[PDB]
Amino acid sequence: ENETKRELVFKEEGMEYAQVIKMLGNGRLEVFCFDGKRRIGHICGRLKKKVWISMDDIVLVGLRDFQDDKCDILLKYLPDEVRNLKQYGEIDENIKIND
């Protein structure tokens, strides 16, 4: 089971990798960023439609210049995209991915 293979997308400049910490509501969440900062993310109008996100998922996060404290949830990684990220050496090898 999976949605069609598409290229694992990396953190471009202005984005950061993140892991979901707790659930807020209104389509919001607290994320731990591999920037090293906690932020409060909002979920994309795109993602609100397609991909349901939950706790401890690994997500890509589009950042904001002005408010660093808020960030936008961009895309969710499939656990395989994640293990691949670890392979590539983008995100640290000690991280908990749950199924």
């Binding site: 069609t4 984005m15 994309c44 795109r46 439609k49 397609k50 991909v51 589009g62 210049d65 961009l74």
Partner: protein, 74 residues
């Protein structure tokens, strides 16, 4: 929904992206003043237009493009 390139929420995004297209250089010019309202009266409220079926009267902007000005003149 796997197509993403730019950061979401960047400030000038759509305006910056838009190609710069230059305004066409006009042969001659648009008459200012009374003469303009003359022009309008002509192409709109003039006798020949009135003579035609008021329910079949053709709406002022119907043509964007010139191919239908060619179809209008024929």
């Amino acid at each position: 929904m796997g197509r993403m390139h730019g950061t979401l929420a960047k400030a000038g995004k759509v305006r910056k992206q838009t190609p710069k297209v230059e305004k066409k250089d006009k042969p001659r010019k648009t008459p200012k003043g009374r003469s303009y309202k003359r022009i309008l009266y002509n192409r709109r409220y003039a006798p020949h237009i009135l003579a035609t079926d008021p329910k079949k009267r053709k709406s002022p902007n119907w043509h964007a493009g010139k191919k239908e000005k060619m179809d209008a003149a024929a």
